[PDB]
């Protein structure tokens, strides 16, 4: 089993770590392959308060009530960061930097990471007022103001989402302009809790250590900056989903994420794509977990039928 | 709002009460309509280790756990057994056996329910060495001798699932042949560690008021009866999914399953189907915390698109 694993699993958060748990339960050579520290996109979050059976609870104690279970089945935990896997049918080899791991089954999780816009004191307050996720902190900051980054589909949403919380609800965008749909723009228009600052960019977000307080906005075309009081800041630039290693396998689309069905399994046969490195709508760790237990299920199955 | 919910759920099983979590903390006006107990088909499970972030966790317990966070976010609980739910486009009605609310947005997460055998002892020792779920409970029983009921292609496939664990498995029937298919009949021929007993139908289980320890086998052609020892029992008769409420929406299969896609969203606009009560192939906690989730998120777009 060392020399061939019934199931290697790529990434360490929830998505990789349900998918562990469920294959290795159902008695299978299970390893994941981790860069880093077992949580993923998690250990940046202060609170989450949408993962059902927990009030409220930080990134990485979740993460680790999630990893702990799993020495109990036997899940071998291997550092590694993949360059390459490549099929061969009835089996598929991983590379790392140093190793390299045979295994009937692919388990893809490493999920997405949130770009982000170069402004210090983003990194600092990241999770503490500033936030790329509506949908994750956006019931923190309750008759708050906010601030919202960008001018395309994401920000306008994200932003008339973040009216069911905040008392106003500003966007700032580098230009005069919205590149959104017509449509979203009347609507944002239309709401009262949301105005607009064109023609600016964000120069640098301050605070006292604990949450955003103001941010230092910059005009592009005369240069000069003003001071906003904020208690919240949301950026939305894009996402990378971290398919490097499996370029050479036509299982991404145009944007880089895994297609897969509902099985999440990939149009090749054996391996496996869960969590946010999906083609999917919600990102959240009741999706990841879903999708993980659903794979971690499938490896049985697929192993069966042979 | 109490005349017009954003969202009536119908169901407090893991599913209802995710798509209750995620949609009142977006702000919306949520109300469970639930017959009894809130948890579902949890509340009889003894122990549950594949949630994760919970090494191991009781049924009532973690349905608890669900269920008081959603206090904080005002989710209004309800008392009810639904018996029709209509729908008018911009608006639904859901009738009680004694009143009726008002929706916008109806979520079915009524669950299904696990048909039984109907014998003396099955219904005292269930999740107590009676089992209807071999993935649930299967990695309880390592080493150990377990009975399967049935003939079809569920109980055929849930023994050799169960060879992964037990030391034997015999499964009983009450004719000479198998119904299932001949790959799956000559694969369970094939494995070593399952036997079967034929012509023959379990007359009742019996053990200590803790564990399942024996079962008393009743032939159908002679009709004398032998006891066996069995540390446990899995019985798959098929399931009964909840959906008498929803005949008049053609919103089922044959069987009765609703019909969704990746939204969770059923061929009626404004109405959703999640967890069990679904056509789907993975029936868990995690899978109905996914799907809970994805409803929960979507009802405030469709209600934001009007
Ligand atoms: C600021 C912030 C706030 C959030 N708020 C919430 C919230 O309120 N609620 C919520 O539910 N979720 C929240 N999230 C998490 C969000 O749901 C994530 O999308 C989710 O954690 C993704 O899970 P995943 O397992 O699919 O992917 P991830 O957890 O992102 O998986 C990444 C993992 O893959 C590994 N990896 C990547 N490439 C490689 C490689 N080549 N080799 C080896 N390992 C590799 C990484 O080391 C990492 O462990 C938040 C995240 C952030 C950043
Ligand atoms: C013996 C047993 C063992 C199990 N073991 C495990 C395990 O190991 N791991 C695991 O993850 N899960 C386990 N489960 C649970 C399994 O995953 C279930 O399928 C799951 O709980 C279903 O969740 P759900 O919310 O989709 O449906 P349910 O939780 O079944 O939803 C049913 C709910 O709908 C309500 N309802 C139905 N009809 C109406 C109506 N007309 N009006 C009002 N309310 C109505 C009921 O009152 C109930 O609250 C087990 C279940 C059983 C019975």
Redesign the pocket.
Known sequence: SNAMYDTLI????????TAALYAARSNLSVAI??????????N??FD????PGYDHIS?PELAMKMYEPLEKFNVENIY????KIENFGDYKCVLTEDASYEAKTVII??????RVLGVPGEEYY??RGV???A???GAFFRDQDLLVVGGGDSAVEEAIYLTQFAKKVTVVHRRDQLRAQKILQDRAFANDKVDFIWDSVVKEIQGNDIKVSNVLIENVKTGQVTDHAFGGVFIYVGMNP?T??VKDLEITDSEGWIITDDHMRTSIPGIFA????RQKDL????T?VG??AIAGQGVYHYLESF
């Open positions: 790529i990434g360490s958060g929830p998505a990789g770590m392959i981790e860069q880093g520290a077992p949580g993923g996109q998690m940046n979050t989450i308060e949408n993962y990134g590694g960061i993949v360059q999780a490493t999920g997405a990471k949130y990241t999770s936030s790329y996720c949908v994750c902190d971290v490097g290693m869960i969590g946010d490195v990102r959240q760790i009741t990841a999708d993980g």
